[model samples]
Target chain A: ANEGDVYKCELCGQVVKVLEEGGGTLVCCGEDMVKQ
Target chain B: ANEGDVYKCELCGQVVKVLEEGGGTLVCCGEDMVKQ
Candidate 1:
């Protein structure tokens, strides 16, 4: 993922940003975050 | 805002992170992002 990319969690309305590039998944509220 | 802080968009499930500190607001989907 690229820096400044955002991911959202539907379960708890949590948001996260990619600070660094990686292939791993971003989990929030027990689910993978959706890229926006 | 502080670096590493996350903000969530309730309307569109968008997420963002603060890369720099500032007093400005973060908008997503036409609304200000909520801190998570």
Candidate 2:
């Protein structure tokens, strides 16, 4: 996997697949920010 | 695409590479979190 280009969740296991404007810790719902 | 394994923001385009501790809303510039 491209470690330098992506990140995973340590809590639920959700991966942010889209880049945004600001930068913060996205709470992954073991799936996605949109899903849960 | 693998929904659970990966996530796609309907608004932005950032993806999490590795699973980390804690969680929040990570604003992206359509790029890597380390970038912005």
Candidate 3:
């Protein structure tokens, strides 16, 4: 399996999974996500 | 291989590797780390 990263959006419990390394912000509820 | 998570401290560029799941804040330069 390919490995990646996971982050959580505080406001809506929206979870994000990143499959590669990159630069940018994961915005949720107009704010950056806090990795969980 | 054992997999985990990685986070970066924005202020000091300090990097942290998490080997387990838990709750808490990762602080650096006297502030909570913004995972990268």
User: Evaluated with lDDT, which candidate comes out highest?
Assistant: 1
TM-score of 1: 0.49
DockQ for each of the predicted structures, in order?
Answer: 0.08, 0.17, 0.04
Model 3 TM-score relative to the real fold? 0.43
* Fnat across every predicted model, in order: 0.07, 0.21, 0.00
Given candidate 2, what's the lDDT at residue A24?
A: 36
DockQ order, best first, reads 2, 1, 3
Answer with 1 or 2, whichever has the higher TM-score.
Answer: 1
Candidate 1 vs 3: which has more lDDT: 1
In model 3, the clashing pairs are none
Q: Please give the ranking of all candidate structures by lDDT, highest first, separated by commas.
A: 1, 3, 2
State the displacement of the C-alpha of residue B18, model 3, in Å, after optimal TM-score superposition.
22
Candidate 3 overall Cα lDDT vs. reference? 0.49
Q: What is the lDDT, from 0 to 100, of the residue B30 in candidate 1? A: 54
Model 3, residue B25: C-alpha shift (Å): 26
Better of 1 and 2 by lDDT: 1
Please tell me how candidate 1 rates in CAPRI terms: incorrect
Candidate 1, after superposition: displacement of residue B17 in Å? 3.7
- DockQ (model 3, Cα): 0.04
Steric clashes per prediction = 0, 23, 0
Candidate number achieving the greatest DockQ relative to the actual structure: 2
lDDT of 1 by residue, B1-36 (tens): 467897666665655575445444555545565788
